[PDB]
Amino acid sequence: APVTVQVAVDPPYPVVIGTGLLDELEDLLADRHKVAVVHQPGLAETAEEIRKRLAGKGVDAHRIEIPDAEAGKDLPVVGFIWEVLGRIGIGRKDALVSLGGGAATDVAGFAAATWLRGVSIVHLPTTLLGMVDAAVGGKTGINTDAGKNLVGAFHQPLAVLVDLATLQTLPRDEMICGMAEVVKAGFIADPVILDLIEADPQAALDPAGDVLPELIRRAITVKAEVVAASELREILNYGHTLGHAIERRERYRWRHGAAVSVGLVFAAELARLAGRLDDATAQRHRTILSSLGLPVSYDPDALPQLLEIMAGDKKTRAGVLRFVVLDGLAKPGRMVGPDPGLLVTAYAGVCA
Ligand SMILES: [Cl-]
Ligand SMILES: [Zn+2]
Ligand SMILES: [Zn+2]
Numbered sequence: 001a002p003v004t005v006q007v008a009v010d011p012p013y014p015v016v017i018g019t020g021l022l023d024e025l026e027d028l029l030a031d032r033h034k035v036a037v038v039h040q041p042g043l044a045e046t047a048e049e050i051r052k053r054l055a056g057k058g059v060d061a062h063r064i065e066i067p068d069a070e071a072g073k074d075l076p077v078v079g080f081i082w083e084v085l086g087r088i089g090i091g092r093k094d095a096l097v098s099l100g101g102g103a104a105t106d107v108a109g110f111a112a113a114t115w116l117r118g119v120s121i122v123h124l125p126t127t128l129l130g131m132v133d134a135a136v137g138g139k140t141g142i143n144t145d146a147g148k149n150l151v152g153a154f155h156q157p158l159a160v161l162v163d164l165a166t167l168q169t170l171p172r173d174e175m176i177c178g179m180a181e182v183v184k185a186g187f188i189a190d191p192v193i194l195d196l197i198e199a200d201p202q203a204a205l206d207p208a209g210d211v212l213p214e215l216i217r218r219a220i221t222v223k224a225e226v227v228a229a230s231e232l233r234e235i236l237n238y239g240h241t242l243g244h245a246i247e248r249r250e251r252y253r254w255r256h257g258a259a260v261s262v263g264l265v266f267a268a269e270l271a272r273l274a275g276r277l278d279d280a281t282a283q284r285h286r287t288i289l290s291s292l293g294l295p296v297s298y299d300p301d302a303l304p305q306l307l308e309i310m311a312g313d314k315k316t317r318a319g320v321l322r323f324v325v326l327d328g329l330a331k332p333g334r335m336v337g338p339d340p341g342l343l344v345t346a347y348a349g350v351c352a
Contacts, residue, residue, distance in 0.1 A: 001018055002016050002017055002018025002019075002021070002024070003016075003017045003018065003217055004016045004017070005017070005217065005220045005221050005224050006224070007136065007137075007156075007224045007227060007228060008224070008225075008228035009138075009156060009227065009228050013156055013157060013158060013159055013160070014159050014160070015135075015136055015159075015160040015162060015220050015224065016159065016160070016161045016162060017162040017164070017213065017216060017217055017220070018162075018163070018164065019163065019164045019165050020163065020165055021124075021161040021162075021163040021165075022049070022050065022053060022163075024161060025050060025053075025097070025122065025124070025161055026053050026054065026056075026057060028122065028158070028159060029054060029057075029059065029095055029097070029122065030057045030059075032059055032093070032094055032095045032120075033059065033060060033091070033093065033094060034059065034060045034061070034062075034088060034089065034090050034091065034094040034095075035054050035059050035060075035061050035062070035094065035095050035096070035097060036061075036062045036063070036064050036084070036085060036088060036090055036094075036095075036096050036097070037050050037051055037054075037061070037062070037063040037064065037096075037097045037099055038063075038064045038066055038081060038096055038097070038098050038099070038100075038104060038107070038108035038111065039063060039064070039065060039066070039098075039099040039100055039104065040065075040066065040067075040068050040069070040072060040099070040100035040101065040103075040104050040126075041065060041067070041068050042068070043099050043100055043126060044063070044065060046099060046126075046166075047063040047065075047099050048063060050063075050097060050099070050124075051063045060088075062084075062088050064081060064084050066080075066081070066104065066107060066108075068103075069101070069103050070103055070143065070148075070252055072100075072103045072104055072107050073103045073106055073107045073110075073141065073142045073143045073148075074142065074143050074144075075142055075143070075144045075145075077107055077142075078107055078110055078111050078114075078142050081107070081108070081111040082111060082114075082115060085111065085115050090115060090116075090119065091116070091119075092116050092119060093119075094119055094120075095119065095120040095121065095122065095158065096108055096111065096112045096115075096119065096120070096121040096122075097121070097122045097123075097124060098121060098122070098123045098124060098125075098135075099124045099126060100124075100125070100126050100127075100130070101125065101126060101127035101129065101130045101134070101174075102125070102127065102129055102130045102133070102134030102135075102256075104130075105123045105125055105130055105134050105135045105140075106134060106139075106140050106141050106142070106152075107140075107142055108121060108123075109121055109123070109138075109139075109140030109153075109155055109157070110140040110141060110142050110152055110153055110155075112140075112155060113140050113153035113154075113155035114153065118155060120157075120158040121155070121157050121158060122157060122158050122159050122160070122161065123135040123157045123159075123160045123161070124160075124161050124163065124166075125160065125162065126163075126166045126170075127170060127174050127178060128167065128170065128174065128175055128177075128178025128179065128182075128216075129174070129177060129178035129181055129256065129257060130178075131162045131167075131178070131216060131220070132178065132181050132182055132185070132216060132219040132220055132223065133181045133219075133223060135157070135160045135162075136160055136220055136223045136224060136227070137223055137224075137227045138154050138155055138156040138157065138227070139152060139154060140152050140153050140154070140155050141153075148252070149244070149314075150314065162216060162220070164207065164213060164216075167207035167212070168207050168208070170207065172205070173255070174255075175205050175207070176205065176257065176292055176293045176294060177255035177256060177257025177258055177294070178257055179197075179204065179205065179215075179257065179292050179294070180239070180256075180257035180258070180260040180261045180264070180289070180294055181219065181257065181260065182197075182215050182216075182218075182219040183197065183261075183264065183285075183288055183289060183292070184236075184238050184239055184260065184264060185218070185219040185222040185223065186219075186222075186288075187238065187264070187281075187285065187326060187329065187330070188222065188235050188236075188238050188326075188330060188332045189222045189225070189226070189235075189330050189332075190218050190219075190221070190222050190330070191329050191330055192218065193215055193218050193219060193222075194284070194288060194329075196211055196214060196215060196218075197211075197215065197288060197291075197292070198288065198291075199211075201288070201291035201292050204292065205292065223236065234324060234334075235324055235332040237315075237324050238264065238267060238324040238326075238332060239260045239261070239262075239263035239264035239265075239266075239267050239324075240260060240263055240324075241263060241267070241310060241313075241315075241321070241322070241323045241324070242259075242262065242263040242266040242267070242306065242310070243256075243259040243260040243261075243262065243263030243264075244259070244263075244309075244310075244313065245306045245309040245310045245313075246259040246262055246263070246298060246302075246306065247259045248309050249302065249305055249306060249309060257294065258294060258295050261289045261294035261295055261296065262295055262296065262297065262298045262350070264285050264289065265285050265286050265289065265296045265297075265350050266346060266347065266350050267285075267323060267324065267325055267326075268281075268282040268283075268284075268285040268286075268326070269282065269346045269349040269350050270323060270325055270335065270338065270342070270343070270346040271325040271326050271327075271335070272349075273342060273345060273346055273349070274325065274335060274338070274342065276325060276326065276327050276333065276335075277325070277326045277327065277328065278328065281326065281328065281329045284329075296350070297350055297351050298350065298351055299351065300348075300351040300352050302351075303343070303344060303347045306347075307340075307343070320336060320337040321336075321337060321338065321343075322334060322335070322336050322337075323335045323336075323338065
């Protein structure tokens, strides 16, 4: 019944896409002695239902509620999760289930990665961004005093269950910000994603339509294929060089997807001015993103503060900025240490 995308790492794991996946979760974890469901607050009820269905099969099943959103990835939260796994007596053969957006899958994933040096985790992402991106690929992380996105671990999930029923209650604004990673996947490796969205941009956002389920499958496949195929993975940062800087500048008060959207537009203008990307494919970034309702511009006077921010990013070595750029649709390449005047000119092409 559901579609499954296999992530061809070693060992491989499935990303299951379908409607009503609790049965598949039950049969998957039926034989574990203990399971802890780590969930964000608005999902207490789905978590309690998972817990009961599990306890029904004989699992000593627990739910662990963590703060919503970015508050949920903070070091004290993972400290709390560890203490709870201990109190419950979660062992090496036991399992965690994450239920929530990207922050939940990241913190629950980091906790599973480090508890007894690694226990199995199943991810149930409940946001579009979580489904196409954060839950696939095994990157986990937490927020510490050092900054965000710095501390983490690679830890592949036993499985990822992408339950489309859950999209029916997702607010429109979260749907739109999840679509920025789908669009990114389209530009880097699967232009059919772009063609499908262009047919009708508003049908792409409809959790009941037939387009969104296909876009999800395709975006997950692009990520699965990149991850299975050590630096090709950097292509997934497309739009994120400026995007992460904007987020930071706004103190994480902008949606991740909105910042990436502006970063994509910037990356396209950078490539266009460098002579690497044709005008048509370059312009297509702004037209697709703006048609979905995503921002395509940012504060015209922010470049100096953005440059200083990008200066300190982990990828920056000896003050040298690195960007993912396209040499054509689905032909990702790199631009290392671009001339400052070129960034200034690209930024003006985006903001003015
Ligand atoms: Cl979240
Ligand atoms: Zn999220
Ligand atoms: Zn992203």
